[PDB]
């Protein structure tokens, strides 16, 4: 994985370049954003369980998904589902702190579409639940931080489909 | 006090 | 129609039971002396 | 003139972002460095003990246990580790010989796949060669699952690699041939991603007797 | 099941480790009866000194009822 | 079932089923019709079992249907009664199969995560299973009721 | 693995409904054959080594399979073939007791052809040994039980070709 | 505290404390007078914080103070408010120490098992803490409330 | 382990009491020494290899301990002995920073005497070496800091004895 | 980068970053501007840092630039300065990052094997970095030099 | 693995035949070559590091692969590349001694393409390097032994291409 | 083979063959003709070695060739002599190779499983090989017999 | 026992 700083450093190293003006700007921009990232991250962790609870309630409750024959039916599957939503929120928060989605490509999306097609997990319902997580988190962290989480949660959604 | 419903949200 | 597991199938049963909710209790942390009221078995 | 030492460190031609991204992630994955090794050096810190335990569950079972247990069957095992009556190695073997492990990584798969998932979880790697596949196939065929786990975790390789106090972890072996790519294929799959054998058996170069 | 409680001091031979190592050097542990022979051989080969062995669980001489 | 429970146990030891394991499979198949009768009784009386259990539950736990309670309001009460019917349908799976495997894999594995996320008090779900057990054990002979109770009690023990 | 009882229970749970009359008749059918299956599994387990020994004696010995150049040649490969036949009888017995071949699909056939193809194990000779396992087994469990065992020994043979 | 936490991380890598880690400590040990100010505020007004938060909780969760609820009656309601005082007390430990380890080691490891064996709806316990957080905020300046907010949020996150 | 700060907290936790004025007056004292502690810990970190080199030179080198038959003889043992002295200085720095010898009890002395006794590591020479580290440390960080570092190196010495 | 390390540590324990970790990242980003200025200083004086360091190096290790030496001749000498330029560039990466990780990952893992294969006296490479550290120190304030020297010292230790 | 001798034995074993006169001729041919193989092997082992050093100098250095962004760039990757070249030379020496390439198919080539293709190692560049190793070792051990080592280094290269 | 054995020993240590190993290989190739003569001797007299040794075996173990014995009857007796022929041929493979691995890989790994499956008394097989060792030894000089005996004793020691 |  790489954060915003090491992305700049590694791309400079590949080109054999000292950090020029454009690189310094990108580093300054991440440093300025740093305070708002740690604040949003601290908020999300305090509300992680409640965020997923609300997102499930508003996207995946009292539908055919949770009824017999739905992919969330049975307690073990319900638990596996909300466990999955917890994954996306936590890793999306990692990416938000890092200012870089690479951790998502590496530790979340690798093999995920294949795994869901194997187990029959409905991706459409999953992306809906992630979208609901995006709405709920934005209400708690704010508008600016909400958009930042929105970027990375959308990144997961687009990697699923 | 809230009253929770059993209908799917739209 | 309603499918299996749909909570609508038990709405009639729920109304028949018509469970009695406890009355909104009359409690106030202001009136409670914590150190005196906590049991001391 | 541009100093010669500057020209000797220059990159020929401009590099576009694709070339930059490809060149930045070439070679062995950064996951080899970007990890944590849970080495339980003390039992006084219960938070560290619990962190080591939960890492152990994630290593052996590939994720946290909550969504596929009713109640925890490892509580006494955690009590022993936390009380320094056993070591991490004994805790790790206790996980491999548990009914939960049998349900997860023995019953759903044939003994051939049990072998490679076994070495993945407990040794950190795909099976070395056909001798190792043979050795564990006889153990499974004759003594069952618990004997197989006991063989891996009590072997000299395990102790030299992970020792008594360290949770196993993903390895990036250089030797022997094909161990790196086979281990890579094992660890680049999610749990239950498919029902396929990464290493069904090593194609022999010289058939003895044929 | 029968279990041994064993004490062992296992030195370091081919490396000078820098992390704390006391926990894996001098330790006391419970070993299932069915693992002691193998485990004792392994410690001996690693140069370890077996300083104490006790039958923590079970009884000597049992014919039936080993669990 | 009892058959899969034994097979999985013997397979993990690379062995054929023991005499004892075959004994209890033989007994299970011999007493099959008694199990199907107990299962037939619960299915037919499910509506009265859940309602009378639902009624008994809320009188012991009036809080859960009070403001702030998880089952507060008629619509949540209907959901709660639905959950009782789920676990009633699973007890009948246990009896016919002779093993609690259908119960565990459908309704108990990970259940604590599900009810924690929903905020449902788990000890109150267990109580509703007691109530169904009592209403059920009065609709059949003691021997039939006793067999049915064992599977009700298994759920009560695991949820508690 | 699912046995006959599990399939009925799962066929109803997926619909979220109690066991009706048709499901009860499927359970009754399995309950009827419980003694037939248990008796056969008892004798098979008593004679497992003998069934394989005589199946091999009748099927593979004194042929080019065991002579120099044949895949059973050398003591190592002789033992491996014996071990494999022990598998096929023990797992066919599991399937017979369960009245369902799921355990064969999961614990036996998954990837078996890949394994044998990489090692050069002859499929056709393996099928003959399994068919000989069937004929030897039938002569020992009677004809009715040997018919049910034949279904699951044939299932392995079918899954191998 | 902050010092122990730094030492533990450094010891896990078999190294001396980094100059950055020695910066956080140095800043902490010179900014500590403000930390003691926050602790004095919370300590001095602990009664009003708990009772105002306790009353706010009962508004949102009247069921827990109703018949059948875990805090029904004065003896149980007092015990509930007593637990609130514990967690407020543990927060002052965290603020002064500059780390949550004092909090986690006293009141969050196995908290789920303790409140499960008692029947307390831990979600409501999480709600009570965030009520104390809101009341505590009003008694403190923005910067002081933000300093104490992390230790309030940490407790809330470990009950949820 | 416990530092000076958490020692004050623990004395209050076991009484269930909020930190009172006297408890705060303890914490003020530790906060007042923070600067000197952090300063000394930075000096030692920079001179750590040098301190042991000098302590070894005046305590162990050119005695029977390093000569054939001595427990420092052979390169493995010499290096192991310096590695142990690295331990002692580094852990005493932890205990100096925390102002509390508890970490010494948990991570240094826990099983050390038994390990040294079994391997033949002479305690008296190890104590002599540690005392030399204390004197060398004192000449480099000052008098009061060296007094505190001496307290925690003397704790190990008495612990080994 | 402390940000990457914290996420690595947090994800290895399958948890959100603790409040202490987030505080360290906060202090890290606040001190970014001072780190960037030091990087700009070294980056601006790159050519004179290398050239003067190389001249100092050859003054005290004349063998390496005399006939038979690894760096003898113009081309080999420029390659030696090119290598010094590499390590100065890595030092800037570390300065900005606030960590030695870019230095170790890029130019120190297996450096001994590389220079042994090339027949380059490694102790002279360590000297060259020492020479670059002395030169660079005289281009920045005492505090700035002390911060930059940790990265130079890290390279030197790994070449010894 | 199979050497020249066991190649004779295996060819006899698969037919179930004792070694006849022609088979003894093959063993004699290999025994007569033993002195040449042993002497070459000792010279190569004593010069392995220098063989690779010169092979790298003339085939890899001062090219795109060593400039920043290149696969050999960074000290780790340079060191890994030298290590790989050490392996190829050492296993070719095994093969040259054995008089049989089967060790190369088993202990070198098995999964090698997959490894390099996943890492982005340049296959052409490693082949050019091995060819440089072939040229260098030939000028050290002579034409006859150089051509014998050339067979087994060329065998590796043909495996990679 | 001696060459393969030393190579696998050297590869296991990731090293070139040691001088001791290279000297053993040099001696083996230079004494090659002497070994092949012993193998030629065994090969040419294989008929009489097996027949006489087989004749002695049945005198030493008449039960194996009695009713209920594994080798009872001319046809089973033929397979027993065939097996002895198998093992003699393997001894000649070991002689010319200077190593037992060709013997082990062909006819000793899993030999206990094979003969217990067949019902053959394995120790009688050890006796049959033992008998072949005397007959073979009496057809050659003592020094040649000693070289072949080592491989006869290896087979005997493994089955027994 | 016959092998024919
Ligand atoms: C009644 C005794 C208690 C109670 C129940 C209650 N449950 C819910 C909501 C759900 N319950 C389930 C349960 C299951 N799904 C399964 O697949 C299984 C096994 C087959 C079980 C047991 C689920 C999935 C839900 C979510 C709703 C949905 O069906 O989509 C509620 C409502 C929760 C809310 O706030 O929406 C209630 C009230 N509550 C009590 O207080 C009783 C102790
Ligand atoms: C919930 C919104 C939806 C849903 C989820 C669901 N998932 C599974 C099973 C798995 N999910 C994953 C995914 C991941 N594992 C990881 O480690 C990561 C990267 C951090 C991800 C994204 C995996 C690997 C599995 C299988 C292994 C495991 O469960 O641990 C299930 C269970 C499927 C089954 O048949 O058991 C479910 C139900 N299902 C829905 O219907 C929702 C839309
Ligand atoms: C409760 C009535 C009393 C009490 C209990 C208490 N026990 C411990 C710690 C341990 N208890 C055990 C016991 C077992 N572990 C097992 O695996 C089994 C066998 C099935 C038993 C009986 C152990 C091993 C420990 C130590 C390890 C651990 O924590 O699990 C504690 C904690 C002590 C501490 O500070 O660590 C306590 C509180 N304490 C009372 O005051 C009650 C009278
Ligand atoms: C040096 C002053 C004296 C000396 C030292 C010496 N020690 C060993 C071996 C070990 N030393 C330790 C000590 C520790 N390990 C830890 O983790 C910690 C806690 C932080 C301590 C204090 C241990 C455990 C060992 C054994 C394991 C190992 O070395 O990793 C030796 C070598 C013993 C041998 O024969 O192998 C030596 C020489 N010896 C002297 O004579 C000096 C007076
Ligand atoms: C016997 C009828 C035929 C035969 C068999 C044979 N098999 C092997 C090797 C293996 N067989 C297996 C099989 C399984 N592993 C599983 O998990 C399952 C599910 C129960 C099966 C069936 C495996 C994995 C191997 C490889 C490991 C090992 O040998 O233990 C061999 C050896 C091949 C070789 O050269 O190594 C043989 C001889 N061969 C015949 O000719 C018969 C027709
Ligand atoms: C000479 C080529 C180089 C050199 C040597 C030198 N050595 C020392 C001091 C010591 N040397 C040893 C070495 C060993 N002790 C062992 O047990 C083993 C295994 C047999 C070895 C190799 C030791 C332990 C010492 C410490 C002194 C003591 O013996 O008590 C010195 C003195 C250094 C000083 O400042 O005291 C010297 C000079 N120095 C060079 O420059 C040459 C390259
Ligand atoms: C100068 C202080 C010393 C010195 C240098 C020197 N180096 C080489 C050749 C090479 N140096 C490198 C170095 C690196 N590659 C990397 O990826 C890294 C990290 C980014 C480093 C430091 C490499 C790869 C080479 C090979 C040539 C090439 O770049 O393709 C030489 C030339 C050696 C030769 O014979 O060609 C020299 C002179 N030499 C000294 O004596 C000084 C001590
Ligand atoms: C040098 C001529 C070229 C080059 C090499 C290079 N290799 C790697 C990484 C690996 N190399 C191997 C190879 C083997 N493993 C074996 O067991 C054997 C059989 C004897 C071989 C040949 C493996 C498995 C790896 C990956 C694992 C590891 O590196 O330990 C690298 C990348 C190293 C990295 O850490 O990223 C490199 C640079 N690169 C070139 O550009 C040359 C053409
Ligand atoms: C004679 C000393 C003993 C004896 C022999 C005996 N063997 C068999 C049958 C077989 N023996 C083998 C052996 C091998 N196959 C191989 O590939 C190797 C090469 C190393 C060996 C040694 C095999 C495969 C068979 C099966 C038949 C076949 O060849 O296809 C028998 C016949 C047993 C039966 O009932 O058929 C006998 C009698 N018996 C004794 O009592 C002597 C101690």
Tab-separated table of N, CA and C in Angstrom, chain F residues 2-3 6 17-33 35, chain G residues 30-39 42 97:
chain	number	residue	atom	x	y	z
F	2	UNK	N	-28.172	-36.557	12.651
F	2	UNK	CA	-27.321	-37.451	13.424
F	2	UNK	C	-26.382	-38.217	12.502
F	3	UNK	N	-26.806	-38.469	11.264
F	3	UNK	CA	-25.964	-39.194	10.317
F	3	UNK	C	-24.769	-38.343	9.899
F	6	UNK	N	-22.237	-37.846	12.801
F	6	UNK	CA	-21.362	-38.994	13.002
F	6	UNK	C	-20.334	-39.114	11.883
F	17	UNK	N	-17.390	-45.448	10.895
F	17	UNK	CA	-18.213	-45.196	12.072
F	17	UNK	C	-18.045	-46.312	13.093
F	18	UNK	N	-17.957	-45.920	14.357
F	18	UNK	CA	-17.811	-46.870	15.441
F	18	UNK	C	-19.110	-47.648	15.650
F	19	UNK	N	-19.057	-48.752	16.398
F	19	UNK	CA	-20.309	-49.446	16.743
F	19	UNK	C	-21.319	-48.545	17.428
F	20	UNK	N	-20.864	-47.676	18.330
F	20	UNK	CA	-21.784	-46.776	19.004
F	20	UNK	C	-22.445	-45.795	18.055
F	21	UNK	N	-21.677	-45.248	17.112
F	21	UNK	CA	-22.253	-44.310	16.155
F	21	UNK	C	-23.305	-44.987	15.291
F	22	UNK	N	-23.024	-46.202	14.821
F	22	UNK	CA	-24.036	-46.941	14.077
F	22	UNK	C	-25.232	-47.273	14.956
F	23	UNK	N	-25.003	-47.498	16.251
F	23	UNK	CA	-26.102	-47.829	17.151
F	23	UNK	C	-27.117	-46.699	17.211
F	24	UNK	N	-26.642	-45.466	17.387
F	24	UNK	CA	-27.556	-44.345	17.526
F	24	UNK	C	-28.178	-43.928	16.205
F	25	UNK	N	-27.526	-44.204	15.077
F	25	UNK	CA	-28.199	-44.018	13.798
F	25	UNK	C	-29.313	-45.042	13.643
F	26	UNK	N	-29.062	-46.284	14.057
F	26	UNK	CA	-30.090	-47.315	13.978
F	26	UNK	C	-31.278	-46.962	14.862
F	27	UNK	N	-31.009	-46.528	16.094
F	27	UNK	CA	-32.092	-46.124	16.982
F	27	UNK	C	-32.844	-44.935	16.409
F	28	UNK	N	-32.118	-43.975	15.839
F	28	UNK	CA	-32.759	-42.787	15.294
F	28	UNK	C	-33.722	-43.143	14.171
F	29	UNK	N	-33.313	-44.037	13.272
F	29	UNK	CA	-34.190	-44.412	12.172
F	29	UNK	C	-35.351	-45.259	12.673
F	30	UNK	N	-35.136	-46.040	13.734
F	30	UNK	CA	-36.206	-46.873	14.273
F	30	UNK	C	-37.295	-46.024	14.920
F	31	UNK	N	-36.906	-44.984	15.650
F	31	UNK	CA	-37.862	-44.105	16.294
F	31	UNK	C	-38.260	-42.939	15.418
F	32	UNK	N	-38.156	-43.119	14.102
F	32	UNK	CA	-38.403	-42.014	13.195
F	32	UNK	C	-39.828	-41.499	13.259
F	33	UNK	N	-40.803	-42.409	13.298
F	33	UNK	CA	-42.200	-41.994	13.238
F	33	UNK	C	-42.593	-41.184	14.468
F	35	UNK	N	-40.573	-39.132	16.014
F	35	UNK	CA	-40.059	-37.797	15.732
F	35	UNK	C	-40.953	-37.067	14.741
G	30	UNK	N	-36.350	-42.465	3.877
G	30	UNK	CA	-35.006	-42.642	4.409
G	30	UNK	C	-35.027	-43.426	5.716
G	31	UNK	N	-35.973	-43.117	6.603
G	31	UNK	CA	-36.071	-43.854	7.859
G	31	UNK	C	-36.282	-45.341	7.619
G	32	UNK	N	-36.980	-45.697	6.541
G	32	UNK	CA	-37.230	-47.103	6.251
G	32	UNK	C	-35.934	-47.843	5.945
G	33	UNK	N	-35.027	-47.213	5.205
G	33	UNK	CA	-33.788	-47.844	4.772
G	33	UNK	C	-32.665	-47.715	5.792
G	34	UNK	N	-32.958	-47.231	6.998
G	34	UNK	CA	-31.901	-46.988	7.965
G	34	UNK	C	-31.193	-48.254	8.407
G	35	UNK	N	-31.949	-49.332	8.621
G	35	UNK	CA	-31.325	-50.599	8.983
G	35	UNK	C	-30.507	-51.160	7.827
G	36	UNK	N	-31.027	-51.064	6.606
G	36	UNK	CA	-30.288	-51.553	5.448
G	36	UNK	C	-28.920	-50.887	5.358
G	37	UNK	N	-28.878	-49.562	5.511
G	37	UNK	CA	-27.614	-48.842	5.406
G	37	UNK	C	-26.702	-49.131	6.588
G	38	UNK	N	-27.252	-49.143	7.802
G	38	UNK	CA	-26.421	-49.347	8.984
G	38	UNK	C	-25.812	-50.743	8.974
G	39	UNK	N	-26.592	-51.749	8.577
G	39	UNK	CA	-26.062	-53.106	8.527
G	39	UNK	C	-24.927	-53.214	7.518
G	42	UNK	N	-21.757	-51.678	8.738
G	42	UNK	CA	-21.117	-52.492	9.766
G	42	UNK	C	-20.215	-53.555	9.148
G	97	UNK	N	-24.371	-44.422	3.836
G	97	UNK	CA	-25.060	-44.150	5.089
G	97	UNK	C	-25.901	-42.887	4.987
